[PDB]
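I'd like us to work through together how a protein chain folds, taking it slowly. To get us started, please write out a protein record for me. Label the sequence line and the structure token line clearly, so we can match residues to local backbone shapes. Once you have written the record down, we can walk along the chain together.
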Amino acid sequence: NNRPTDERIIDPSTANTQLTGGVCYNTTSGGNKPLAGSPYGYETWIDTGGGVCSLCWYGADQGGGAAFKATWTNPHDFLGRLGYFWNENKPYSHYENIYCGFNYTRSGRKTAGDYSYIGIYGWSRNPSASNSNERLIEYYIVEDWFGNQWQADTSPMGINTTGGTVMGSFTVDGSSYQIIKNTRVNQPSIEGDKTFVQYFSIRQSPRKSGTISITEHFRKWERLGMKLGDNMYECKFLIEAGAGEGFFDARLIQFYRADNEGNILQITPLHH
């Protein structure tokens, strides 16, 4: 593939103007909810047994179209996410070359509990997999996290946080990523409580701005035998906080998709 060079792509490294005027959601959404005037949808998971959480979308016309701010006050595994919702019986390759340009600020080390994740997230279904455990996939491309009492937020998380097995690694978008496969045994999922697999790419050098070549991760996982199947559910930008009191505030979240030649097939947002 040729890296896309289109003038609509916002340079992440200098996309650092604070956004205002969000539309905020304070409760669990019960799945994907489409956003007004936008190709994207959001999802919130906010436990009523924890404290106040919110996700505020910055709208269709600024910050690349998918930017949001999230806050949590002593959550129990807050997840706020926003981006592509698919679920139309297609494998990842149907969506061509997927990218996400991003720039955010966040609260510091130890403001999000013992585990936390920032990056790209979703699910995929693979019903024809011979191993029943691999028929449902939850996936993460982890650009950053909040560390914890024991480990700096500048140090990449490993299998003591994610669980599972290091499968390999590769280098893309300026860092090595460690690839991890984990099995979740009888755990909540988009298909009810069951056994399913998780795929992780962990950025070895955490960062708060840049471009994620999402498709490159999908390709690498499949080469290692971590198959995604033929029904991709979604592809969204996530903040997940196990606990703590913190925030995440994006100045840019811009998804776009291109052909192999580097022509833009989809970008947001849609004279001087």
Notes: The chain has one domain: 1-272.
